[PDB]
Design a protein around this ligand. Structure first.
Ligand SMILES: [Cu+]
Ligand SMILES: [Cu+]
Ligand SMILES: [Cu+]
Ligand SMILES: [Cu+]
Length: 504
């Protein structure tokens, strides 16, 4: 229904520090209930936002900048979305901020049980500090921050609690990539919106078996509408030149498969973990929840054109050409402000291969689940609940191969905190046999990663009927972290596990 391409794409302002010196940068971000218009033709929407903004302000830091952010909850004491009480005396509204892809001390990582309520009145069992510490001793990259509170993540994020966080490495400046105004984040979230403009989040699955509690969690969420940077199907006026985009899938469930309707190419220059070693010319790319693509789009040859960023991946069905087949629209009509001095270099960074690592351990992990007393699917990593004693206990400074078995019907974007990792390969196997006997026979050879996945990843798509192998060096910090599916509906029930990085 909503008319496509009638609102300009908002560019979230960069957060200004409360105090800053050479030794440290200090920010304050408070979560607020606020209203914002999401489309020219809608009444304002009630949202929860970092500093009352949706998306939250973009935070920009340098490699090794010593940063502190005091994340504060100043939200209402009751939620506005359907809470399922059967899945977890504590406050109804709990929040904790996770800097996804951050190389972070464990008590600044936004552990699900380090949640806090309004003004920190009550705090979860794993809470230690108000002011998070981000030393940012990691590669230049696109991070994003979002809520991570136990049993509430799918809800708090859907409410609007997402933002971008960029680490700039000054040594990457020589590459001369598009920058400043020509470097633009795109946070993509699908939403379903009611006529009065309020957010809709389902309080039960369709055909609620009379067994189900009310509200009941749902296995997956697909929105009828795509937003980018907080506007339904927006347009961006661009100059006819090279642009850099930080593409972030900030949606609960939905996977995008992006292309340009004029047949133009993306130049991939970066993955979750930063610059790829070599740029990759791409015609389409898959982007599952929490994945990030750092791309250049060359508008030089398309002056005057309107180009749709299009999507082909279904979400609980085929794309509707009028709705979710559309993400946004570029209009190459802005006059040049100056000569395009930016570059699209082939040679970007050292290969991850350059470093030789002793494999200390090899974990086999399965994506499984069971069914609760109401008949619902309960998703589990290794048939273990979140509350079960920890089993993933890598040693600090060591490298493991994780071997992720997926006998389910769907893809799972598996995310590991603290570390970025590389991809080894994927291999199809007999699902019926694995389920019958617990034994694994591969039905075809190993497939190494495409160039897209030959850098550093931290969220990785594990396709159905495959075994995915990744290699991660755990460090530099020890402590209590998490690994989980990043489909929020899965994560909350109950596809999330503790991870202890140990000291010897
Ligand atoms: Cu995340
Ligand atoms: Cu994360
Ligand atoms: Cu999942
Ligand atoms: Cu997480």
């Amino acid at each position: 229904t909503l008319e496509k391409f009638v609102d300009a794409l908002p560019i979230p302002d960069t957060l200004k520090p409360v105090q800053q010196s050479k030794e440290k940068t200090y920010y304050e971000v408070t979560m607020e209930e606020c209203t914002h218009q999401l489309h020219r033709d809608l009444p304002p929407t009630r949202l929860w936002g970092y500093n009352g903004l949706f998306p939250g302000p973009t935070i920009e830091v340098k490699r090794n900048e010593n940063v502190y952010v005091k994340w504060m909850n100043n939200l209402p004491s009751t939620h506005f979305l359907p809470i399922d009480h059967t899945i977890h005396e504590e406050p109804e509204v709990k929040t904790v901020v996770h800097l996804h892809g951050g190389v972070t001390p464990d008590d600044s990582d936004g552990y699900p049980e380090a949640w806090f309520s309004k003004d920190f009145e009550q705090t979860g069992p794993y809470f230690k500090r108000e002011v998070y510490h981000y030393p940012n001793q990691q590669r230049g990259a696109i991070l994003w921050y979002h809520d991570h509170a136990m049993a509430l993540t799918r809800l708090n994020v859907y409410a609007g609690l997402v933002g971008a966080y960029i680490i700039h490495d000054p040594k990457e400046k020589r590459l001369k990539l598009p920058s400043d105004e020509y470097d633009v984040p795109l946070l993509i979230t699908d939403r379903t919106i009611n006529e009065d403009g309020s957010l809709f989040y389902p309080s039960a699955p369709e055909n609620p078996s009379p067994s189900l509690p009310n509200p009941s969690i749902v296995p997956a969420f697909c929105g009828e509408t795509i937003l980018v940077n907080g506007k339904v199907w927006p347009y961006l006026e661009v100059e006819p030149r090279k642009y850099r985009f930080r593409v972030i899938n900030a949606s609960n469930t939905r996977t995008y498969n992006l292309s340009l309707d004029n047949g133009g190419d993306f130049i991939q220059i970066g993955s979750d973990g930063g610059l790829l070693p070599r740029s990759v010319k791409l015609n389409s790319f898959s982007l599952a929840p929490a994945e990030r693509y750092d791309i250049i789009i060359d508008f030089t040859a398309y002056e005057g054109e309107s180009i749709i960023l299009a999507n082909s991946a279904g979400c609980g069905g085929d794309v509707n050409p009028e709705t979710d087949a559309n993400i946004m629209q570029f209009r190459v009509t802005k006059p040049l402000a100056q000569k395009d001095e930016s570059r699209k270099p082939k040679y970007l960074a050292s290969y991850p291969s350059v470093q030789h690592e002793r494999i200390q351990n090899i974990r086999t992990l399965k994506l499984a689940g069971t069914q609760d007393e109401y008949g619902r699917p309960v998703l589990l990593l290794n048939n273990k609940r979140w509350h079960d004693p920890v089993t993933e206990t890598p040693k600090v400074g060591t490298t493991e191969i994780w071997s992720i078995i997926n006998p389910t019907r769907g893809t799972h974007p598996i995310h590991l905190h603290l570390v970025s990792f590389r991809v080894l390969d994927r291999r199809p196997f007999d699902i019926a046999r694995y389920q019958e006997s617990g034994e694994l026979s591969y039905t075809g050879p190993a497939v190494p990663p495409p160039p897209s996945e030959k850098g550093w990843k931290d969220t990785i798509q594990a396709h159905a009927g495959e075994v995915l192998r990744i290699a991660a060096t755990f460090g530099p910090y020890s402590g209590r972290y998490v690994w989980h599916c990043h489909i929020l509906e899965h994560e909350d029930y109950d596809m999330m596990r503790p991870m202890d990085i140990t000291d010897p």
